[PDB]
Write a protein that binds this DNA or RNA. Structure first.
Ligand SMILES: [Ca+2]
Length: 258
DNA sequence: TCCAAGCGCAACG
DNA sequence: CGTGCGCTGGA
């Protein structure tokens, strides 16, 4: 299944096992998780597939000072583990200053990255993670290292898309005309009997992406921002201690009962 | 309202 | 197993 189906799978399990107290609804944002326990001891639960990413921060190369600057637009504050990563990269500036989409791994002790993850998720009121290796695994953030292997890389990650808007509609219609695609627009919704799912077309310094929705196509404008971020990858361990697993399930059962 | 940017997410070539 | 779109400050 994909990650969206996986998150629904996790929420459904929580509600059927522990009662209808686990919300995944409404708007989200990066300062919180996607699943909220709505009891007297509220907290967020992070669902992670066995192979996932697990947080990031943008660093800007300063080629005059030969160091990396923490982006003032990042959404989490510098903690000591952020500082260790930045210090390592800055002391090795030449090796990290040529940004790449392939990325360059950061060979610091895994505990530095685990500690960054713990700090970051604690700061977002994420107290537990849920994953699955065939059975559901729920554990508190303080025991993260017993469940996931962690690595860290610095890579260009292009920023995300935005919905086609009225201001861009003329350029998009003209891009369709240029590409020879037969179409009709109903507001910002695109209609065509051509097979244009995932189609990319460009015009007037905008790269457009076309995706099939219920009965029509939705149009997105892709980004032109190509900054680089430290970003964490996690892989579920094959050898999780059953003793830790059991005490961690009891920790969760305590947390939802306070 | 719109755009740049950062964080969400494993996806997929 | 070695790359970026969907979503959410300030002008
Ligand atoms: Ca990595």
């Amino acid at each position: 299944m994909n990650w969206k189906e996986f998150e629904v799978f996790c929420v459904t399990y929580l509600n059927k096992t522990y009662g209808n107290k686990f919300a995944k609804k409404g708007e989200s944002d990066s300062t919180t998780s996607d699943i909220l326990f709505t009891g007297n001891n509220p907290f967020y639960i992070e669902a992670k597939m066995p192979h996932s990413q697990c947080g990031q921060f943008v660093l800007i190369p300063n080629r005059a000072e030969y160091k990396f600057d923490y982006s003032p637009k990042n959404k989490s504050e510098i903690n000591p583990y952020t500082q260790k990563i930045m210090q390592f990269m800055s002391e090795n500036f030449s090796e990290y200053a040529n940004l790449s989409t392939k990325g360059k791994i950061i060979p610091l002790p895994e505990s530095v990255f685990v500690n960054w993850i713990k700090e970051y998720y604690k700061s977002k009121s994420v107290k537990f993670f849920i994953t699955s290796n065939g059975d559901f695994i729920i554990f508190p953030i303080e025991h993260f290292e017993h469940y996931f292997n962690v690595s860290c890389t610095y890579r260009i990650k292009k920023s995300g898309s935005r919905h086609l808007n009225s201001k861009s509609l003329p350029d998009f219609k003209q891009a369709l005309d240029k590409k020879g695609i037969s179409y009709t627009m109903r507001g910002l919704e695109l209609h065509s009997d051509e097979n244009i799912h995932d189609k990319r077309i460009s015009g007037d310094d905008k790269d457009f992406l076309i995706k099939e929705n219920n009965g029509a196509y939705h149009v997105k404008i892709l980004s032109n921002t190509f900054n680089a971020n430290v970003i964490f990858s996690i892989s579920l361990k094959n050898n999780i201690s059953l003793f830790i697993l059991n005490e961690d399930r009891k920790a969760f059962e305590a947390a939802i009962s306070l």
